Amino acid sequence: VGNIPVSMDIADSAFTRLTDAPVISELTCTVSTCTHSSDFGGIAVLSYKVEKSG
Amino acid sequence: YEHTAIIPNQVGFPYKAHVAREGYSPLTLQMQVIETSLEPTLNLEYITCDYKTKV
């Protein structure tokens, strides 16, 4: 039943810094195959080069 | 899935059938035939033997 609502006061260690993160370049997401009702369903190919990995 | 096709009834001629399901590469089934003989259901009404007179 229902939908459990909740606020999550997240810690700054969870808020891992965006400037301190590796930056990826040129993301293109290509959905290869979609099932209309499955569990996994969508095979999507995010093609995006990595100026900074991680 | 469950494909259905009609291969030719001329044996030797290979029959491709590329079935494409979800997430699989196209499975091309190869059909080949040999010896599909007819065998009609019959019933004898003769023996076909020669006569022999007993005198």
Swiss-Prot record, chain B:
Topology versus the membrane: Single-pass type I membrane protein
Residues making up the signal peptide according to the UniProt record: none
Localization: Virion membrane; Host cell membrane
Post-translational modification: N-glycosylated.
Organism superkingdom: Viruses
Assembly, per entry: The precursor of protein E3/E2 and E1 form a heterodimer shortly after synthesis. Processing of the precursor of protein E3/E2 into E2 and E3 results in a heterodimer of the spike glycoproteins E2 and E1. Spike at virion surface are constituted of a trimer of E2-E1 heterodimers. After target cell attachment and endocytosis, E1 change conformation to form homotrimers. Interacts with 6K protein.
Known function: Class II viral fusion protein. Fusion activity is inactive as long as E1 is bound to E2 in mature virion. After virus attachment to target cell via host MXRA8 and endocytosis, acidification of the endosome induce dissociation of E1/E2 heterodimer and concomitant trimerization of the E1 subunits. This E1 trimer is fusion active, and promotes release of viral nucleocapsid in cytoplasm after endosome and viral membrane fusion. Efficient fusion requires the presence of cholesterol and sphingolipid in the target membrane.
Name under which the protein is recorded: Spike glycoprotein E1
Biological source species: Mayaro virus (strain Brazil)
Residues of the full protein shown: 807 to 861 of 1242
